[PDB]
Structures are given as structure tokens and as C-alpha cells.
Structure 1
Amino acid sequence: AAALARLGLRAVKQVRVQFCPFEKNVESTRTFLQAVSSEKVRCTNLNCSVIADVRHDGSEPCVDVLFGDGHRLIMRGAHLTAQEMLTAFASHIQARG
């Protein structure tokens, strides 16, 4: 959550996280949620909304992030680890923006 704060999230439009709480594989995506939801990252820009989509049946956890490059970054955490998602997020959404 700190490495996201240092990186100036203001280049982002909308961040949603779609996941399924009763699956065994979702801990990673959750960790991502609480990393982006933190006060530092949340207050870097007020133009960005963070939406948590919670469903029992969907069965596939997902993270979708739009930003003002006209870019859409969608990472499906299934077997992906938390800090791999956050590193991918950092190098992807910072270097472009």
C-alpha cells in the first residue's frame, strides 16, 4: 500500500474489484483491495472511485482499472499473488500516464 502511495495514483479514472468471498483462491485479490483502499492511495486523488463487487456465484476473481491514457488494465487474479498484482499495477499504470 505504500509503494502505491509513493507513485501518485492521480492518473487513474476508476478502480473496481470483482471477487467471490467463498472461494479458496481469493485472498490475493482481497490483499489488493485493502492495498488500494488505504488512506494514502485513496487521498492521492479524489477523482478516482473504488468499487468492490461482491458475488457468490461469479467464481472468477478479477481486477479492472481504467486510466486517462484511454487505457484499460484487467488482471484476473486466480493464481496470481498479491505483490505480483501490485508490481504489475505499479509498472503498468505509472510508466503509462
Structure 2
Amino acid sequence: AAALARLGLRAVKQVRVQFCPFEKNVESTRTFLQAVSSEKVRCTNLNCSVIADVRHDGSEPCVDVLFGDGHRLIMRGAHLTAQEMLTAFASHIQARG
């Protein structure tokens, strides 16, 4: 959460995390969602919309980030580590923004 807070997240529009909680590979995406839904992240910028899509037969956790550079970061995280997803997201958004 601190890494996202220190990075200046004012340049993002929409972050949605779509997942099925009843699967066996959801720990990482749940950790990522909790990291991006922290209060430091929320008070960094209020113009962003964070959505948590919950399904049952989707079975494919994924994250979509639409930000004002006209850019769409889609991440199909089914085996990725939570820290790896966090650092990749940070390094992409700071490079493009």
C-alpha cells in the first residue's frame, strides 16, 4: 500500500478487479485488490473508481486499469504473485503517466 501511496496515483481513471472468490488461485488477486483499496490509495486521488466484480463460474481472475493516457492495462493474474503484480502495475503506470 505504501508503494502505491508514494507513487502519485492521481493519473488513473478506473480500476476493476473481476474474480471468483470460490476458487483456489484467488489469494493473489484478493491481496492485490486489498492493496489497491487501501485508504492511502483512496486519499491520494478521489477521481478514480475502483470496482470489485464477483462471479461464480468466471473462474478467471483479472484486473483492468483504464487511465487517462488512453491506456488499458489488462492483467490476467491466475498464477502471479501479489507482490509481482503490484510492482509490475506500479512500474507500468509510473512509466506511462
Under a length normalisation based on structure 2, what TM-score does the superposition of the two structures give? 0.98
Query: Alpha-carbon deviation of 1:20?
Result: 0.5
Task: Tell me the distance in 1 between the aligned counterparts of 2:71 and 2:57.
Answer: 28
Identify the residue that residue 2 of structure 1 maps to in structure 2. Answer: 2
1:51 alignment partner, SS class: strand
Q: Alignment RMSD, CA only? A: 0.5
Task: Tell me the distance in 2 between the aligned counterparts of 1:60 and 1:54.
Answer: 11
1:34 alignment partner, SS class: helix
Structure 1 residues not aligned, in runs of 5+:
none
How many corresponding residue pairs?
97
The percent identity for this pair of structures is 100
Query: Alpha-carbon deviation of 1:38?
Result: 0.3
Query: Alpha-carbon deviation of 1:54?
Result: 0.2
- What does the per-residue CA deviation read over 1:45-64, in whole Å, with 9 as the maximum and x for residues that have no partner? 11101000000110100011
Query: Alpha-carbon deviation of 1:95?
Result: 1.2
Query: Alpha-carbon deviation of 1:67?
Result: 0.5
Whether 1:13 aligns to 2:23 is no
Task: Tell me the distance in 1 between the aligned counterparts of 2:25 and 2:87.
Answer: 19
- What does the per-residue CA deviation read over 1:65-84, in whole Å, with 9 as the maximum and x for residues that have no partner? 01111000001111111011
Task: Tell me the distance in 1 between the aligned counterparts of 2:96 and 2:22.
Answer: 35
Runs of 4+ in 1 over 6 A off after TM superposition: none
Task: Tell me the distance in 2 between the aligned counterparts of 1:87 and 1:76.
Answer: 15
1:86 alignment partner, SS class: helix
Under a length normalisation based on structure 1, what TM-score does the superposition of the two structures give? 0.98
- What does the per-residue CA deviation read over 1:25-56, in whole Å, with 9 as the maximum and x for residues that have no partner? 01000000000000001111111010000001
